[PDB]
Amino acid sequence: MASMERFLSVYDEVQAFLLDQLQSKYEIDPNRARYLRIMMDTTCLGGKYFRGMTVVNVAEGFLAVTQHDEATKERILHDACVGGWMIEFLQAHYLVEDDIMDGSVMRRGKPCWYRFPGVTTQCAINDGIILKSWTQIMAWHYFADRPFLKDLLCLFQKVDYATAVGQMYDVTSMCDSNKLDPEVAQPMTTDFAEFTPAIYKRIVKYKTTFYTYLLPLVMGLLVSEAAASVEMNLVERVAHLIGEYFQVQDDVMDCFTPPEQLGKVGTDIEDAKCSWLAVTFLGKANAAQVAEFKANYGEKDPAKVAVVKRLYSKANLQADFAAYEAEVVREVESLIEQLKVKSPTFAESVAVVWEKTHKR
Amino acid sequence: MASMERFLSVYDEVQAFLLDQLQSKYEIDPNRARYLRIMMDTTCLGGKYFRGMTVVNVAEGFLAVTQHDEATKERILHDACVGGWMIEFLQAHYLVEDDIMDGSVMRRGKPCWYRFPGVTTQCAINDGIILKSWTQIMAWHYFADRPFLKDLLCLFQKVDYATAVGQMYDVTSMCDSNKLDPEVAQPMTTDFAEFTPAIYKRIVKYKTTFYTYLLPLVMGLLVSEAAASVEMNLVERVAHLIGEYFQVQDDVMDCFTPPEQLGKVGTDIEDAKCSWLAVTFLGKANAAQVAEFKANYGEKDPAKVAVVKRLYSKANLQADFAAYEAEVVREVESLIEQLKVKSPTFAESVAVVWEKTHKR
Ligand SMILES: O=C(Nc1ccc2ncccc2c1)c1ccccc1
Ligand SMILES: O=C(Nc1ccc2ncccc2c1)c1ccccc1
Ligand SMILES: O=C(Nc1ccc2ncccc2c1)c1ccccc1
Ligand SMILES: O=C(Nc1ccc2ncccc2c1)c1ccccc1
Ligand SMILES: O=C(Nc1ccc2ncccc2c1)c1ccccc1
Ligand SMILES: O=C(Nc1ccc2ncccc2c1)c1ccccc1
Ligand SMILES: [Zn+2]
Ligand SMILES: [Zn+2]
Ligand SMILES: [Zn+2]
Ligand SMILES: [Zn+2]
In chain A, the domains with their CATH numbers are: 1-360 (1.10.600.10)
Q: Does ligand 1 have an atom closer than 6 angstroms to the CB of A8?
A: yes
Q: Name the residue type at position A179.
A: K
Instruction: Tell me if B39 sits within 8 A of A182, measured CB to CB.
Output: yes
Instruction: Tell me if A116 sits within 8 A of A103, measured CB to CB.
Output: no
Q: How many helices (H) and strands (E) does chain A have?
A: 15, 2
Q: How far is the CA of B275 from the centre of ligand 6 (A)?
A: 13
Task: Please tell me the distance from the alpha carbon of residue B78 to that of residue B195, in angstroms, as a whole number.
Answer: 44
Q: How far is the CA of A142 from the centre of ligand 2 (A)?
A: 12
Closest CA to A114 of A130, A98, A135, A91: A98
Instruction: Tell me if A36 sits within 8 A of B211, measured CB to CB.
Output: no
φ, ψ of residue B111 to 5 degrees: the values are -65, 150
Instruction: Tell me if A54 sits within 8 A of B203, measured CB to CB.
Output: no
Contact B180 A39 (CB under 8 A): no
Question: In sequence order, what are the residues at sequence separation of 6 or more whose Cβ sits closer than 8 angstroms to the Cβ of residue B303?
Answer: none
Q: Could you give the C-alpha distances from B105 to A210, A276, B96, in angstroms and in order?
A: 36, 38, 11
Q: Could you give the C-alpha distances from A63 to A57, A152, A221, A353, B44, in angstroms and in order?
A: 10, 19, 11, 18, 47
Instruction: Tell me if A166 sits within 8 A of A208, measured CB to CB.
Output: yes
Q: State the method.
A: X-ray
Task: Please tell me the distance from the alpha carbon of residue B205 to that of residue B274, in angstroms, as a whole number.
Answer: 13
Task: Please tell me the distance from the alpha carbon of residue A255 to that of residue A73, in angstroms, as a whole number.
Answer: 45
Task: Please tell me the distance from the alpha carbon of residue B89 to that of residue B114, in angstroms, as a whole number.
Answer: 16
For helices B2-25 and B50-63, give the axis angle rounded to 10 degrees.
110
φ, ψ of residue A16 to 5 degrees: the values are -65, -45
Burial class of residue A359, CB neighbours in 10 A (0-12, 13-18, 19+)? exposed
Q: Name the residue type at position B142.
A: Y
Q: Name the residue type at position B108.
A: R
Q: Does ligand 5 have an atom closer than 6 angstroms to the CB of B13?
A: yes
Closest CA to A213 of A346, A354, A309, A307: A354
Within A143-196, residue ranges assigned H as helices are 149-171
Q: How far is the CA of A125 from the centre of ligand 1 (A)?
A: 28
Closest CA to B104 of B246, B305, B273, B248: B273
Closest CA to A1 of A66, A73, A57, A64: A57
3-state secondary structure of A110: strand
* Range 212-251 of A in CB contact (< 8 A) with B: none
Enter the DSSP assignment of A114.
G
Which neighbouring-strand residues pair with A107?
A110
For helices A149-171 and A215-223, give the axis angle rounded to 10 degrees.
180
Identify which of A169, A327, A332 to mutate to test ligand 3's pocket (most ligand atoms within 8 A of the CB).
A327
Question: In sequence order, what are the residues at sequence separation of 6 or more whose Cβ sits closer than 8 angstroms to the Cβ of residue A227?
Answer: A151, A218, A221
Instruction: Tell me if A86 sits within 8 A of A222, measured CB to CB.
Output: no
Enter the DSSP assignment of A228.
G
Interface membership of B188 toward A (CB under 8 Å): no
Instruction: Tell me if A273 sits within 8 A of A173, measured CB to CB.
Output: yes
